[PDB]
Motif scaffolding. Structure first.
Motif, PDB file in Angstrom:
ATOM      1  N   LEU F 173       0.951  -1.009   0.057  1.00  0.00           N
ATOM      2  CA  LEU F 173      -0.087   0.099  -0.318  1.00  0.00           C
ATOM      3  C   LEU F 173       0.473   0.748  -0.098  1.00  0.00           C
ATOM      4  O   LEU F 173       0.545   1.944  -0.915  1.00  0.00           O
ATOM      5  CB  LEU F 173      -0.774   0.361   1.329  1.00  0.00           C
ATOM      6  N   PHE F 174       1.734   0.921   1.093  1.00  0.00           N
ATOM      7  CA  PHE F 174       2.478   1.800   1.117  1.00  0.00           C
ATOM      8  C   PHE F 174       3.519   2.889  -0.548  1.00  0.00           C
ATOM      9  O   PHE F 174       3.148   3.792  -0.644  1.00  0.00           O
ATOM     10  CB  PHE F 174       3.566   2.369   1.995  1.00  0.00           C
ATOM     11  N   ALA F 175       4.016   1.400  -1.021  1.00  0.00           N
ATOM     12  CA  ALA F 175       4.692   0.993  -2.291  1.00  0.00           C
ATOM     13  C   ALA F 175       3.848   1.852  -2.789  1.00  0.00           C
ATOM     14  O   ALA F 175       4.224   3.226  -4.225  1.00  0.00           O
ATOM     15  CB  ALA F 175       5.202   0.207  -3.025  1.00  0.00           C
ATOM     16  N   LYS F 176       2.522   1.632  -3.569  1.00  0.00           N
ATOM     17  CA  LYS F 176       1.374   2.227  -3.921  1.00  0.00           C
ATOM     18  C   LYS F 176       1.038   3.283  -4.096  1.00  0.00           C
ATOM     19  O   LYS F 176       1.103   4.100  -5.241  1.00  0.00           O
ATOM     20  CB  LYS F 176       0.087   1.391  -4.639  1.00  0.00           C
ATOM     21  N   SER F 177       1.228   3.886  -3.162  1.00  0.00           N
ATOM     22  CA  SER F 177       0.519   5.465  -2.434  1.00  0.00           C
ATOM     23  C   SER F 177       1.635   6.155  -3.257  1.00  0.00           C
ATOM     24  O   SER F 177       1.599   7.426  -3.368  1.00  0.00           O
ATOM     25  CB  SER F 177       0.495   5.406  -1.477  1.00  0.00           C
ATOM     26  N   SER F 178       3.138   5.604  -2.770  1.00  0.00           N
ATOM     27  CA  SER F 178       4.688   6.512  -2.986  1.00  0.00           C
ATOM     28  C   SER F 178       4.347   6.403  -5.052  1.00  0.00           C
ATOM     29  O   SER F 178       3.726   7.959  -5.276  1.00  0.00           O
ATOM     30  CB  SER F 178       4.832   5.733  -2.972  1.00  0.00           C
ATOM     31  N   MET F 179       3.840   5.995  -5.457  1.00  0.00           N
ATOM     32  CA  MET F 179       4.396   5.795  -7.138  1.00  0.00           C
ATOM     33  C   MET F 179       2.653   6.579  -7.340  1.00  0.00           C
ATOM     34  O   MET F 179       2.960   6.993  -8.583  1.00  0.00           O
ATOM     35  CB  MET F 179       4.440   4.036  -7.680  1.00  0.00           C
ATOM     36  N   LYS F 180       1.679   6.974  -6.681  1.00  0.00           N
ATOM     37  CA  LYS F 180       0.860   7.816  -7.642  1.00  0.00           C
ATOM     38  C   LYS F 180       1.351   9.152  -7.320  1.00  0.00           C
ATOM     39  O   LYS F 180       0.666   9.720  -8.226  1.00  0.00           O
ATOM     40  CB  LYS F 180      -0.383   7.177  -6.362  1.00  0.00           C
ATOM     41  N   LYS F 181       2.028   9.309  -6.278  1.00  0.00           N
ATOM     42  CA  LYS F 181       2.438  10.654  -6.873  1.00  0.00           C
ATOM     43  C   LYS F 181       4.070  10.727  -7.404  1.00  0.00           C
ATOM     44  O   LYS F 181       4.310  12.148  -8.343  1.00  0.00           O
ATOM     45  CB  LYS F 181       2.889  10.866  -5.005  1.00  0.00           C
ATOM     46  N   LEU F 182       4.600  10.322  -7.557  1.00  0.00           N
ATOM     47  CA  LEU F 182       6.057   9.670  -8.595  1.00  0.00           C
ATOM     48  C   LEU F 182       6.223   8.994  -9.835  1.00  0.00           C
ATOM     49  O   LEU F 182       6.705   9.526 -11.143  1.00  0.00           O
ATOM     50  CB  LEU F 182       7.248   8.868  -7.999  1.00  0.00           C
ATOM     51  N   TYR F 183       4.817   8.962  -9.761  1.00  0.00           N
ATOM     52  CA  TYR F 183       4.619   8.782 -11.541  1.00  0.00           C
ATOM     53  C   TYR F 183       4.834   9.767 -12.790  1.00  0.00           C
ATOM     54  O   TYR F 183       5.269   8.934 -13.527  1.00  0.00           O
ATOM     55  CB  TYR F 183       3.797   7.692 -11.341  1.00  0.00           C
ATOM     56  N   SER F 184       4.124  10.647 -12.855  1.00  0.00           N
ATOM     57  CA  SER F 184       4.595  11.227 -13.594  1.00  0.00           C
ATOM     58  C   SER F 184       5.777  11.928 -14.431  1.00  0.00           C
ATOM     59  O   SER F 184       6.250  12.437 -15.165  1.00  0.00           O
ATOM     60  CB  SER F 184       3.673  12.745 -13.163  1.00  0.00           C
ATOM     61  N   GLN F 185       6.648  11.835 -12.983  1.00  0.00           N
ATOM     62  CA  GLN F 185       7.876  11.725 -13.474  1.00  0.00           C
ATOM     63  C   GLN F 185       8.637  10.715 -14.183  1.00  0.00           C
ATOM     64  O   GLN F 185       9.792  10.694 -14.420  1.00  0.00           O
ATOM     65  CB  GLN F 185       8.792  11.812 -11.994  1.00  0.00           C
ATOM     66  N   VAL F 186       8.391  10.071 -14.930  1.00  0.00           N
ATOM     67  CA  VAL F 186       8.515   8.120 -15.581  1.00  0.00           C
ATOM     68  C   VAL F 186       8.385   9.044 -17.103  1.00  0.00           C
ATOM     69  O   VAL F 186       7.400   8.911 -17.550  1.00  0.00           O
ATOM     70  CB  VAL F 186       7.850   6.783 -15.003  1.00  0.00           C
ATOM     71  N   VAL F 195      11.574   6.391  -9.917  1.00  0.00           N
ATOM     72  CA  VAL F 195      10.730   5.799  -9.278  1.00  0.00           C
ATOM     73  C   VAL F 195      10.320   4.651  -8.410  1.00  0.00           C
ATOM     74  O   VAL F 195      10.104   4.823  -7.575  1.00  0.00           O
ATOM     75  CB  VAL F 195       9.578   6.481 -10.080  1.00  0.00           C
ATOM     76  N   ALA F 196      10.798   3.431  -8.741  1.00  0.00           N
ATOM     77  CA  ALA F 196      10.645   2.224  -8.281  1.00  0.00           C
ATOM     78  C   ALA F 196      11.689   2.403  -7.701  1.00  0.00           C
ATOM     79  O   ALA F 196      10.609   1.450  -6.535  1.00  0.00           O
ATOM     80  CB  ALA F 196      11.014   0.880  -8.991  1.00  0.00           C
ATOM     81  N   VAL F 197      12.950   2.263  -7.235  1.00  0.00           N
ATOM     82  CA  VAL F 197      13.700   2.134  -5.952  1.00  0.00           C
ATOM     83  C   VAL F 197      12.863   3.435  -5.036  1.00  0.00           C
ATOM     84  O   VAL F 197      13.453   2.710  -3.744  1.00  0.00           O
ATOM     85  CB  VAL F 197      14.521   2.878  -5.728  1.00  0.00           C
ATOM     86  N   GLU F 198      12.538   4.300  -5.528  1.00  0.00           N
ATOM     87  CA  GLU F 198      12.034   4.872  -4.184  1.00  0.00           C
ATOM     88  C   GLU F 198      10.620   4.494  -3.711  1.00  0.00           C
ATOM     89  O   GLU F 198      10.635   4.348  -2.319  1.00  0.00           O
ATOM     90  CB  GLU F 198      11.689   6.375  -4.828  1.00  0.00           C
ATOM     91  N   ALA F 199       9.656   4.396  -4.464  1.00  0.00           N
ATOM     92  CA  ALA F 199       8.689   3.366  -3.892  1.00  0.00           C
ATOM     93  C   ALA F 199       8.893   1.854  -2.239  1.00  0.00           C
ATOM     94  O   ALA F 199       7.937   2.086  -2.237  1.00  0.00           O
ATOM     95  CB  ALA F 199       7.863   2.945  -5.188  1.00  0.00           C
ATOM     96  N   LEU F 200       9.934   1.587  -2.890  1.00  0.00           N
ATOM     97  CA  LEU F 200      10.497   0.516  -2.058  1.00  0.00           C
ATOM     98  C   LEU F 200      11.300   1.348  -0.566  1.00  0.00           C
ATOM     99  O   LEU F 200      10.574   0.646   0.076  1.00  0.00           O
ATOM    100  CB  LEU F 200      11.103  -0.766  -3.176  1.00  0.00           C
ATOM    101  N   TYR F 201      11.512   2.261  -0.898  1.00  0.00           N
ATOM    102  CA  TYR F 201      11.931   2.969  -0.007  1.00  0.00           C
ATOM    103  C   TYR F 201      11.224   3.781   0.774  1.00  0.00           C
ATOM    104  O   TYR F 201      11.097   3.210   2.203  1.00  0.00           O
ATOM    105  CB  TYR F 201      13.243   4.365  -0.703  1.00  0.00           C
ATOM    106  N   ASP F 202       9.984   4.048   0.422  1.00  0.00           N
ATOM    107  CA  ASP F 202       9.194   4.396   0.914  1.00  0.00           C
ATOM    108  C   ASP F 202       8.207   2.689   1.496  1.00  0.00           C
ATOM    109  O   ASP F 202       7.082   3.338   2.875  1.00  0.00           O
ATOM    110  CB  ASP F 202       7.973   5.076   0.088  1.00  0.00           C
ATOM    111  N   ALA F 203       8.036   2.009   1.476  1.00  0.00           N
ATOM    112  CA  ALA F 203       7.532   1.145   1.720  1.00  0.00           C
ATOM    113  C   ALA F 203       8.001   0.651   2.907  1.00  0.00           C
ATOM    114  O   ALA F 203       7.998   0.352   4.220  1.00  0.00           O
ATOM    115  CB  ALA F 203       7.813   0.083   0.965  1.00  0.00           C
ATOM    116  N   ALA F 204       9.691   0.316   2.471  1.00  0.00           N
ATOM    117  CA  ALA F 204      10.988   0.328   4.295  1.00  0.00           C
ATOM    118  C   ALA F 204      10.177   0.990   5.103  1.00  0.00           C
ATOM    119  O   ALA F 204      10.478   0.700   5.879  1.00  0.00           O
ATOM    120  CB  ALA F 204      12.036   0.124   3.605  1.00  0.00           C
ATOM    121  N   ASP F 205       9.775   2.344   5.186  1.00  0.00           N
ATOM    122  CA  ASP F 205       9.581   3.579   5.873  1.00  0.00           C
ATOM    123  C   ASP F 205       8.945   3.239   6.822  1.00  0.00           C
ATOM    124  O   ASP F 205       8.868   3.498   8.442  1.00  0.00           O
ATOM    125  CB  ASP F 205       9.506   5.039   5.036  1.00  0.00           C
ATOM    126  N   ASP F 206       7.747   2.435   6.372  1.00  0.00           N
ATOM    127  CA  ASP F 206       6.335   2.216   7.539  1.00  0.00           C
ATOM    128  C   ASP F 206       5.885   0.522   6.981  1.00  0.00           C
ATOM    129  O   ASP F 206       5.157   0.903   7.608  1.00  0.00           O
ATOM    130  CB  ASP F 206       5.167   2.737   6.163  1.00  0.00           C
TER     131      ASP F 206
END
Lengths: 222, 248, 221, 224, 251, 252, 222, 246
Positions: F173-186, F195-206
């Motif tokens: 869920l965390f990863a998905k919500s993160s990509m929802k915001k970062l996707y336009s940058q792809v 973007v993918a490594v960042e979404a996974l970073y956000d997931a590890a955070d929570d």
């Protein structure tokens, strides 16, 4: 294609095929004696038996194709052990083992591909302390069974061995004398320890009658 | 199939029903003395608090160099000794040679393992095996004691003694003190009869020597000359010695 | 077809078998001080005719490969299984031979084509024991023989058989035995063309060992 | 009821012949070792039906005979190899094992089926990426006989001529082009163009899957 | 299809021989670590049933072929059977195929035996194995040693950390090695660190027995390098034990 | 009996013991992400494994190239996930060798769905395996839109993502919500992989079950990128570099 | 060279094969008397029976190949015990056992590789206290079933024995008279340790079957 | 497969429907020199209601043995007829009766094969009494064998045994009265008394009904075989006990 093979032409050929295999194999004799029952067979090999224990007071001896009579030895040991377990050791008899072999060979003869090139003897001495006349049974490849009073001969050419024995059989013979007579009969067919396999069912032994007479002792007896 | 020459197998396939499926409670001990091993067991059987049997034999000679004592439900135990003896002799007759000691142990473990499901429901049989191994290099060290857990795991005792059954803890603690006194089969037999005395003292399910009816533990001793049943009188007289010595 | 009877059916198959063996490479197994030696003429570098069955039990065959590899695999299954159900020390050459006898005997009787094979089961003693090696030969027929010193199978034997009869020596050194074997083998008729192995009593557990390349070449030297 | 019996010898000759002839009537195939590893050339007019295939990573298959029958064996070999590589590891699957299996199989079909298989096949194995092992070639007959070939294998149609031509000209560690030319020439003796050829190699220089089909224009370049 | 698997064969012909499915003595600690050109593995000797000590001589580490050993922690009967069975399985493939399994194949084969026991393990007949081996075909001789652990579902993992442990005292043993590992520079120092981690486990876990100086029972160990797998001799371990013990006192 | 040329069917028929299904506390937990970029798709996964609160593994690889144009990432019980990744690649290559031609993308999907569905009984009992499939379709009419992302529910239901990204696992869920915001940058494989490594970073955070980049041991997420030239493993260093970039941005 | 006879031939060959085997075996007679039913068979052996009990008032006698009729004796015992258990002992009849053997031989004859070289007799006396004429049935290898009023003869060469019986048959004969007549009939075909005697005794309360042996048998002849 | 000449196996293989698959009674058995005697009550109950008052629970199963069965009446009766057929079936097939040990072993297998059903209420607990001709000493020839629900069997050294709902009372009574047994008649008196005592303390065991004239049934067995004791000889013995009780 309504034609059928000849039942008679099959009987005859199988019968022959068997008869020749037996006739072509080493010989064995089993005879009653005071000691109980003696087993002598001409056997060059030292690893392959032709005489075995089936149960407490029940012995087995055969002539013919080895793989085929070893097979029958094993199944008789299974049948005996199983009946002794389901009832009591004292309910297992030589008569029963013989009756079974008859049914078995009878069936192999009629249904298996090749009949069995074998002839066998089931012998039973009395239980420790009883006084019962030993019993000998011969079962043919055909599945025929015979109740022999004093001795049985099987394997190779029998008539010579049979007559010498008939001519030379002595009731309640001492074991050594009996052994000598048996060996004498064997030569008639056409002796060294290296040339024999000997064993006896001992009435005297308390439970397991069967005993193999080997090497030095056998030499002494000879 | 594959033939193992095992009577248990063929018996199972041909006549499975012949196979084994409440009275219980027994104490069986075993110890090693130089060039020998001895094994003894009590004669009691109980159903709850009631004494159901007082003559029960639980130690049997299973072949010329081995005996087994089985603890647990008597019905399971009595059959087990019979079946295992037949299994052993059956292999000897088929192959003309007895099984090695290690093979006898393995066959027994398999029988026990097969019975685990039924042991979880009460038909528990925990065996103790005692044997003298001719093939082993030292006659003094020839004797063997093997115990089995319910899953068939087996263990050979480097301890010198072992026990199984409801009074086994008492028996083992007793031998732990008396063991140094074993120096030959006679002292070894004394210590065994004493360990069983101690077990009967602290466990109501183990019966001790009944002097009124003259019923005593049964024992078997095994050395290089084979397994022999110890005669009653020698046990009775070893009991009175112990009793007399306790009232003192 | 050439519809036949019980007796010639056996006669025919019997021949069918004999020929096949006759036409194959040869193998010899002989008792020696080291224990038992296995030598077979084998050009191939991937296909074995000599193998390990169990700890102190070796196997050698001649005949049709797919048919004896088949036997080799089932022997290994039978041995492994008996040694697991009992103990490794309860597995014997006599038992493996007895099994092969029963098997070939049945194949011979119940199969369209009898196996074109002849085999040898050899057993040395256990580390430290002192027992005379044992050699057994099992025919396609299923007949079994207890051989005291050596066994010869495959191709034309009489020459090879007599040559060894003429020169066999008990307790021969391994190198000497190897030379004798090659000579006997030659009569029947090279290292890159030889398959050699031994069952060794000296080894603590696994008696079997393959003598290859350099070492083998060195032995003839 | 009662059993009957047929002559063993007569059946074998007719059956063995029934097969010898069929394989003889078939198109031909050659397989030979080279510096690149192993080369497969077969005369094959059809564009949809293969006679040369990949079995496993470094193990190739080539056959001659009746198609439905060897496609059948190709499939089962792929099942056998995939299964063993799954139960153990990919590196445990060997050409020697696949060959041993085919031997057992043809051997049984020959003895038990109504009509033996009219096929002859080759199992070839190159070394693993980075290793240095001599390529292995095996030939398995309808009879079930198996052979360990050092440099090349020939099957299908008339092979006496083809085997001999190769024997006269085979050279170890040949360039791929040279090997291809040698193969084409040997095939001619038995009986050819990109149009009628089927070519593939077990390229030992490939990281994992050694098998590669040389087709169309690339094939044309090698020929000229 | 035919897999030259003694186990697969057993299932078709001899299901009885198998361990089967549907308190038993248990409780062991087993460690393993990698040292240059080698790997070493050691296990304690105790067996308990509840609070009672049921065994004090139990061997839990077995050489399974020339380059591998397995240590099994869990139910004793099952562990021992697993050890015997796996060794036969390995030698069976070698005899049928004339060549030993690759290391990865050995692992996969053990994993299938474990995974096929999950049902039984849910019911208490657990066997969690630890595998140690040296790979001959490995590219580098120094880095040859391998340690593989298995979870109850058959999942296997090859540790890269350098050490691993399984059993009731495994957390203690692992935390100990975590501190002592830098001291491992050769087979002898690695054999010291292993016996110490097992000492530490026995210190904090009553199910793991430490060195019995009165009866003279010590952990058993096996070391494996390019020359194969060898049982470490008792006396070398006893001497290492007394060193550690002595060292824990004052001197 | 019909030959579907299925490795799985063969086992089911011939060697079930080999079959992963073991229907009758295990290491589990992972977060896997996948997104589409023009003419490409990227997929990445964390390296942690946990048993309860204990960290059981820190090097676990959960993303595997399964054929030249596809990769799968599996979240759930680790043993099961590894088994599936291995089994599915064999199944794919087996069909290709038997039929001489690779499965169509839809056929690959369908085959994975059957393997998943046939594990429902086991998954009810905790042996869960939830796969994410990323692939490039050669036969797609347009190269830019060729990349595919497919998710599976536990009953084998599969869905193709029109959204552009997807994730599975405990931190999905965390990863998905993160990509929802970062996707336009792809806009390409590189921005897509960031973007993918960042979404996974956000997931590890929570999520404590998802492990983030371990700078002390140097363990980072694994990734695979797939475009018209096939599937390639992204090199560790390119990811370590990307990680540090995000980490510094996160702190500065 | 192997042959393929046709339906007519197979029919005649099986039939012959059977008829010979029977004609070549020892003989047996069973005859009605006031005492009930008497069974006499020439039998050298002391262990192998040719006359047996099937059920309470139902006896069995056979001639032919032993393993084959022992087989049928056993199955008849299983059939009788089973029906007596499922219903009541009084519901088991000789007519039923005969009807079963007919069905069985009939099937073996038609479907087995070889037919059964056997001929048999099922006899039934009345229950204790009733007054019913004994019943005798003969069942051929063919499976044909015959309802015999006074006596039945089977095995070896019958005509002589049969006629001797027809000429000398005694109705309500003392057991001794019946025995003498039976002996005469058996004599024509071809001792006390060569005879097997038994009878179904109407007088006995439940199990009518009784074997007359040794000493007691000696007195009866004369 | 191996044949065992067992009617039971035959049934399992071909007539499973025939195989077996109201309780509370007392049965006693004791050894007297050269003999064994066995007796049982006649009551049958369903809960607290008396369902039967004439029930026979002791049956002669062959010339030298009898069996008494305690538990559900139907199960017990079916078991006895089946066991008797099994015994006579082996005799007809083999021409010779089973050894005593074999007869025991066979009964044990029938019992054990009913353990699952006994757990569910169809419990049949048999008591076997027999005289062994082959036994070395004629005086000690008689045998008493009891079975537990799992088929475990035990031959009785104490000289007497009982089974059923009043078995403890009957056993305690014989424990006192046994020394008075010196012959079949005293042995038979002690048996009818032990059963009297059981009926006194257990409502599920019925004692002698003097109004309807129903009494326990008994069987005695010595070297001359097994025989039903005549009712009148028991009624007499009963009346003596009641009068003695006063």
């Amino acid at each position: 294609f309504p034609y059928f093979i000849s039942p008679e032409q099959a009987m005859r050929e199988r019968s022959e095929l068997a008869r020749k295999g037996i006739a072509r194999a080493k010989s064995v004799v089993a005879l009653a004696y005071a000691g109980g029952v003696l087993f002598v067979a001409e056997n060059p090999s030292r690893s392959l038996q032709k005489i075995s224990e089936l149960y407490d007071r029940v012995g087995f001896a055969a002539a013919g194709k080895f793989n085929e009579f070893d097979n029958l030895r094993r199944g008789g040991i299974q049948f005996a052990d199983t009946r002794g377990y389901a009832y009591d050791r004292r309910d297992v008899t030589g008569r029963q083992l013989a009756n079974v072999y008859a049914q078995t060979l009878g069936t192999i003869f009629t249904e298996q591909a090749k009949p069995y090139e074998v002839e066998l003897c089931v012998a039973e001495v009395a239980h420790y302390g009883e006084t019962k006349r030993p019993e000998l049974y011969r079962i043919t490849y055909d599945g025929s069974i015979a109740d022999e009073p004093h001795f049985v001969v099987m394997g190779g050419t029998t008539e010579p061995i049979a007559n010498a024995l008939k001519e030379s059989y002595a009731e309640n013979a001492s074991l050594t004398d009996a052994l000598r007579i048996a060996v004498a009969a064997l030569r008639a067919g056409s002796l060294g320890v290296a040339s024999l396999e000997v064993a006896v069912l001992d009435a005297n032994r308390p439970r397991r009658a069967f005993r193999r007479i080997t090497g030095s002792a056998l030499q002494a007896l000879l | 199939a594959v033939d193992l020459s095992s009577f248990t197998d063929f018996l199972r396939r041909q006549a499975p029903e012949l196979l084994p499926a409440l009275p219980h409670g027994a104490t069986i001990v075993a110890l090693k003395y130089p060039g020998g091993v001895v094994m003894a067991g009590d004669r009691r059987s109980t159903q709850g608090n009631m004494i159901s049997g007082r003559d029960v034999r639980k130690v049997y000679i299973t072949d010329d160099y081995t005996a087994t004592g089985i603890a647990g439900t008597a019905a399971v135990a009595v059959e087990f000794a019979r079946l295992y003896a037949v299994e052993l002799e059956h292999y000897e007759k088929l192959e003309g040679v007895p099984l090695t000691f290690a093979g006898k142990i393995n066959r027994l473990a398999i029988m026990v393992r097969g019975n685990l499901a039924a042991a979880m429901q009460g038909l528990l049989a925990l065996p103790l095996l005692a044997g003298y191994d001719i093939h082993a290099s030292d006659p003094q060290s020839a004797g063997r004691i093997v115990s089995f857990d319910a899953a068939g795991g087996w263990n050979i005792e480097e301890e010198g003694y072992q026990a199984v059954g409801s009074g086994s803890l008492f028996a083992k603690s007793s031998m732990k003190k008396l063991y140094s006194q074993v120096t030959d089969g006679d002292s070894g037999l004394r210590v065994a009869v004493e360990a069983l005395y101690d077990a009967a003292d602290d466990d109501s399910a183990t019966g001790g020597p009944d002097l009124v009816r003259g019923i005593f533990p049964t024992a078997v001793i095994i050395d290089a000359d084979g397994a022999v049943d110890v005669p009653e009188s020698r046990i009775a007289e070893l009991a009175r010695a112990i009793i007399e010595s306790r009232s003192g």
